[model samples]
Target: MAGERFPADFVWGAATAAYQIEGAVREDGRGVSIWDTFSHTPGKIADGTTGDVACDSYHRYGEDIGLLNALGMNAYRFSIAWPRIVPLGAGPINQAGLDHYSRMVDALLGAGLQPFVTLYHWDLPQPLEDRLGWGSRATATVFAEYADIVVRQLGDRVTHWATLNEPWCSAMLGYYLGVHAPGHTDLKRGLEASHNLLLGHGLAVQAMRAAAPQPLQIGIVLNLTPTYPASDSPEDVAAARRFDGFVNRWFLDPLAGRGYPQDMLDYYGAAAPQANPEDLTQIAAPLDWLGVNYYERMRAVDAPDASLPQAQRLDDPDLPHTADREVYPEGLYDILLRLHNDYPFRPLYITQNGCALHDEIAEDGGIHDGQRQAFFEAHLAQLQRALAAGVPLKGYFAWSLLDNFEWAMGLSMRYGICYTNFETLERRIKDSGYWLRDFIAGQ
Candidate 1:
């Protein structure tokens, strides 16, 4: 397939989260985050690792910026470290935190790049976590206060604001399954966290708008995966519907003001917690735009009766799309089209899109990752198709700027166009990085 084209004004850049890249944990009165405590624990991270000095982007941002320049991106989407700004989550503001971001934003502007700020990227201030984290109503108020402070300090220079990045991860991974930071495995608490995070997004939106001088493009980033069943059997179809309701519809319905979808409620039923009217109102807050993160698809089968607490897994090796999860770039087009046609036709951005390929570094001080390059090309082709279909996609930013801490997988998975040596802290551009540089330049 030929490359799909984008509008002249479409944004092309890369994204990074504070906990994933920035490594100034103890600098300038910055308090420890839940991740800091979680990763420090003995068996929590592989190789007993932590983000204490991951990329040293805090002190070595100049080099990071140089990398962004080399990639030919027009913008850099990164989140602010809330603990650095308000050490205790609320109350007094920290000058050092504000200064760090102020300087970074200034540098981006100086480099002729737009600054896109994501308010929360799963770095909940540790103080709030002590009081129940996202499960508590107080956390929502604290989030709004933090949002107000950030908007007052940097909103003048930054026009784009994201309320939260992948709240489902915040809820499911952090609260439900306990794979990520602040790990806890409770279904009820996970549902509660989901509602509260959306509420916080709404409250934060109001606060940012009140303090922001420039017109704000406020939105939330969600990781939406298109799930498919392994067979044509009724049980298999039911299994797919259940999976989609939990992973995809659970978040979109509330954000779109339709409340939780009946499909979701029917699937989870008594296992799902009750929602109050006030919470529903907050969860259904108005959004100016929406951000999507798509990676791979899931194939599921129905569980057998009385075999386990949930459904039992059956083998279906003969399934066509179930064998190996192939990267279908066309899946992205289907997703964007569905969002544009069914939901509120708000502007959208491809916040995070990249793949984890087996990579190797050569002796010439470079990495030749052809698989990663192909992944980008396939996805970019689909993005071009979305643009032709008028999907209101204003931007497309790759999943990462550097290979940093990758949650449960740690440093094992490589997803960045630029590879970072964990031991030496050296950054090297891979073959895909050069491809992106030319791609952005051509755009």
Candidate 2:
């Protein structure tokens, strides 16, 4: 595939979250986050580790940005730590926090890179979780205020802002499954949390619009995994429908001005999220663009005795699997086509798309991650197909820039093209990194 064939103005970059990379969890008035709390809990993180000093990117951003430049990136998509900006959830402004991001953005521009910022990326201020997590409407209101402050301070330089990164993970993984921070296994709370998360996106979009120094492109990031049925059986087909409505339509429907899907609303019934009179109106706030983070294609099968959806994921060992999951590049194409055909089309961006693989240094001390390199090539080839089909894909940001803290998985997962040596906090460019550098340069 020829990179030159892509749109000349395409946004070629990598994506990252604050808590995933930055280790200065206590520096410069940075308050405690739910992650900070969860990582400290025994048996929480697999490695018995915390992000207390992950990569020290909080202070080594200069080094990180240099890696981006070396990769020939045109943009860098990163999130701002909520606790860093508004410590203790909400109260007074942290001028130091604003100043830190301001400097970061200025340097990005100096390096001829666009700063695409994410307002919230799952690192919620721990106090907010203590109050009611994301289930209460009060949290959405607070999110709007925080969004206003950040845009007002850094909006002068940052033109593109994502309100939240993968709220599904925040609500489902964090609230429902109890696998993430503030871990709680309450399905009811997860449902409510989902609505509030979308509400926050709506409120934050409004806040940033009114607070930006100039016109800004504000949007949300959703991890939309394409769902399929194993066979033509009625139960299997129904399982696919329920999985789609629950996972995909739950958020996209509201954001696309259609409100929540009726089937899912009925499926949840009494446990459904409470929606106020004008809440849907706000959730339908117009988006300058939409982001799709496609990593896998899930096959769902009916399970009569299971949970709400009564479905179970059926993985096929016949297919190649990554360290974290399966290798399904076609999933990206499938998701892009669904968005174009099923919903009100908006300019789309592949905000997060990559797989993690356990990597090892070679005999020559070089990290030869051939599988990861193939993973990108296969996905990029599908992306080329999406372009041919005329999907309004404006950009593509790889899942990460460097191997940093991976939440509950800790640093055990290597998802970045640029590797990080935890012992010395040094950055190593793997073979996949070299592949990406050349791909970006159209070499």
Candidate 3:
């Protein structure tokens, strides 16, 4: 791990989102989000629990900030709740909501950690969903308007801004798969949502650029997976190709200024949204940097015709990843190199990367999740290898800062360096959190 040590200026941070953590759902004029409705529904979330007061991050964020400071991270990447700012989606600004975020930013600065604000992290205000959601063009316009309101208020302190986080999840999982909030299973609508998300990003970028006075770093976060075929069979290879084109290339091609890959369009057939020159131009808008979320690789084997529209992955008898997840550490290096080779830009950030482990609280008031620690080290080793090959990666932010209400999964998955007691709303640093602190300091 000699040259694997990061550059002097490389940022080490933790990431979290408002809706997932900051629970005071009814506090200070914060309007209902689609998540509020989804989780409240009896059958939507597992275990019949809601995020009504999950983690109570809204009231206890200072304690969370203290953990960030103790970890010695130089930066923190977090999302701002749209509903908190504009209760009705687009209208008068909420001063109380502004005060909440302003206080958080002040806390970060006071703790000597740079704050990176993500404008949207999939918690679309319920009113916006009532109007058009991410499917309609008007939602994109409203997103841009919300971005302007945020910048005018907090732009002075926050230097790095991500217009959107994992737009594909917002489109596919939320809109198409019926797994997340505003759940609907419509392939054509998913395409429309995806297109509008990109359009929203571009419009937000234009608005932020016009309003900000100081130097700004604007970007978007995308989750990219490296796909591998299960075997040498033609069907397996084709399955792998579709998985790559659908998940990775569908987003990367547009960001790379090539528009959505034609193969994706051909695969989607009539389900794909009609594209025009102007739509492509907006989707490919230039950005200062890209944020990548890498988790694991997918091993594909062909499925039957019934699932033809989507890539059918064969179920491996062996659990490929930890907790029966897809765990291919090698894919990290491969995906980083692939991006470096294909993308026009150089500066990038590993904005989110971590694994979930079944953890229990120890007698010392700590959670010893050694499995997650090993996963962290293994992934960092691959990331280091990529850096040695000159990937131009700038930062590494762990997937989460604290365990909050994991969407749909409730509190079952522990991906945070810090553990939170859902009942008491207490925070405890895990063994991995301690290891990461020393790891960062030793570097």
Off by over 4 Å in 1: 1-3, 304-326
Check candidate 3 and list the clashing pairs. Answer: 321-327
For all candidates in order, the CA lDDT equals 0.82, 0.89, 0.85
* lDDT (tens digit, per residue) of candidate 3 on 1-443: 56558888989999998888998998998988989988988788877777788778899889888889989999999999998999888778888998999999999999889998999988898888987698889999989999988898889999899999998899988888888888878888888899999889988898888788776899899998788888989988888898898788888888788878888888899888787878778877778988999887877777646443445656566654565366667788999999898777658899998888777898887798887787778888898899988898999999789887788887777678888888887788888888888888988
lDDT tens digits, residue span 190-260, model 1: 87888788889888988888989888888889998776677889987877677677777888988888888
**What are the models' TM-scores?**
0.94, 0.98, 0.97
Name the best candidate (by TM-score).
Answer: 2
At residue 190, what lDDT does model 3 achieve? 86
Would you give me the overall lDDT of model 3? 0.85
Error of 1 at 114 (Å): 1.0
Model 3 stretches with alpha carbons more than 4 Å out: 306-309, 315-320
Output the number of the lDDT-best candidate: 2
Go through the candidates in order and give the C-alpha RMSD of each one to the true structure.
2.8, 1.2, 1.5
- Tens-digit lDDT track of model 2 for 1-443: 44446887999999899998999889999999999999999999999889898889899999999999999999999999999999988888888999999999999999988999999999889888889979788899999999999999998889999998888898888888899988988889898899999999999999899999899998789999899998889999999989888788999988888878899888889888767659999998889988888889889899889877788889988889999898988888999988988888479999988879888878998789999999999998998898888899989998889898888899999999888999999998889988989988983
Positional deviation of residue 240's Cα in model 3 after best superposition, in angstroms: 0.8
What is the TM-score ranking, best to worst?
Answer: 2, 3, 1
